[PDB]
Design a protein around this ligand. Structure first.
Ligand SMILES: CC/C(=C(\c1ccc(O)cc1)c1ccc(OCCN(C)C)cc1)c1ccccc1
Ligand SMILES: CC/C(=C(\c1ccc(O)cc1)c1ccc(OCCN(C)C)cc1)c1ccccc1
Lengths: 246, 246
């Protein structure tokens, strides 16, 4: 039961579920000018998605939900989740975005990546904010978890009895993550006021991540494929797994 | 000095700055089928904007900022501010959106308003959430203020000394509003844990309001005018006021 976990149990659970940092797929020995930035990012995102699924399934309370709800939450939050991870790893690289350990781009270079005319600078600003706030890994994982659960909680299908139970559960887990964040801050020696203030500062950044995701999706949709299986179905295929590999 | 205000002083200040509820402009005696929903909403929004300016100038700390920064914050947050007001007044009208006291539309009716294919339902969901949470007016005004100050704090021009001072001031005011929200909750008899949890629940709703604003702007831009003075300049004209009427 995810609702019985203690703060320390929540943090350890989340830290343990952290996905790996992937590398971009390209010939390091071959010219950089040849590669396509969007092709590289698209390929990176596609590989990260599989791992994101694995991660989501390990976020306490997520698997307690229905398959359809798990799919909806991920379809809503996937890009925000990729972006917050990106901002996090770019924290110690002022002026640059570490898309991957072998793919670090600066402002000027960004000016040439399609669909990033506005968001590159927004992402840098967010990374800078995390740096000023001295965001901790324990805090980062709670935030990423909040995004996954909060993403599409208010865009759910209907109001069936099961749907009401689902929403309630999500809000209870979210409440548990808030408690965890406060605990982490209390442990760090922050005063009560400093605790409330930091919690708020952190949650307000999530509105900026949503903004960046919306702007990114606007571009991705403006170059949408044709007869390509919908994200929903791909997520479903990956989420709707059997236990034959148990 | 807005930074010296007490919680009770902050709330009274915000409540006092509340803008009036405007009416839609149309012949109540004439057929409804004749009017254009987007024309009505556009005309309503335009009139609300002037009053929003007046309101912003009365949000503690806002006028301490530069004119250019005041304009940037409003250009980023204006639609979120209109939307949160809309959700707030539709709170006691399940299944309907009270665009104005003389303009209440239900789901089915929304299905016919351009640009609202997705956001109508999202707005209803938000109103429903506020209802379940039993959101208070004192809380609502703090939230609207947070939107105004948080909106474009991370999309500011450069990093000049003045810009760094500006950002710091905004974050200090935001911190003061957080304290105010916690105070309001403590006064309502909520426990410390219930306080942190509610603060988080309220701030997470702001990410959904940002989402709705982005979707709305997507449509508005898809029907953008030509030789029409940019929003920035209109906001500037309204904000850059003289004191000859003092
Ligand atoms: C911010 C970089 C980025 C992507 C990205 C972000 C973080 C990360 O870890 C990896 C990639 C990005 C780019 C493309 C993309 O494609 C997904 C859609 N495919 C399935 C067609 C996803 C993310 C992007 C998104 C929208 C527009 C421009 C760039
Ligand atoms: C949600 C209703 C709405 C508007 C609205 C919201 C709250 C409120 O109090 C009043 C209106 C809306 C519609 C049009 C609009 O136009 C502004 C641009 N003009 C200057 C060209 C602004 C808001 C809207 C926005 C985008 C798409 C579809 C509808």
């Amino acid at each position: 039961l995810a609702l019985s976990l203690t703060a320390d149990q929540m943090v350890s659970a989340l830290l343990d579920a952290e996905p790996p940092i992937l590398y971009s797929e390209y010939d390091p020995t071959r010219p950089f000018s040849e590669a396509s930035m969007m092709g590289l990012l698209t390929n990176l995102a596609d590989r990260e998605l599989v791992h994101m699924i694995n991660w989501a399934k390990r976020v306490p309370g997520f698997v307690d939900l229905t398959l359809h709800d798990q799919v909806h939450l991920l379809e809503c939050a996937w890009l925000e989740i990729l972006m917050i991870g990106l901002v996090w790893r770019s924290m110690e690289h002022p002026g640059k975005l570490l898309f991957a350990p072998n793919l670090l781009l600066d402002r000027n270079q960004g000016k040439c990546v399609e669909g990033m005319v506005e968001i590159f600078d927004m992402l840098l600003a967010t990374s800078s904010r995390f740096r000023m706030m001295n965001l901790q890994g324990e805090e980062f994982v709670c935030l990423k978890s909040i995004i996954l659960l909060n993403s599409g909680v208010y865009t759910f299908l209907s109001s069936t009895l099961k749907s009401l139970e689902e929403k309630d559960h999500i809000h209870r887990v979210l409440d548990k993550i808030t408690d965890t964040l406060i605990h982490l801050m209390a442990k760090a020696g922050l005063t009560l006021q400093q605790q409330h203030q930091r919690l708020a500062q952190l949650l307000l950044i999530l509105s900026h991540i949503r903004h960046m995701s919306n702007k990114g999706m606007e571009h991705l949709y403006s170059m949408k494929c044709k007869n390509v299986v919908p994200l929903y179905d791909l997520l479903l295929e990956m989420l709707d797994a059997h236990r034959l590999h148990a």
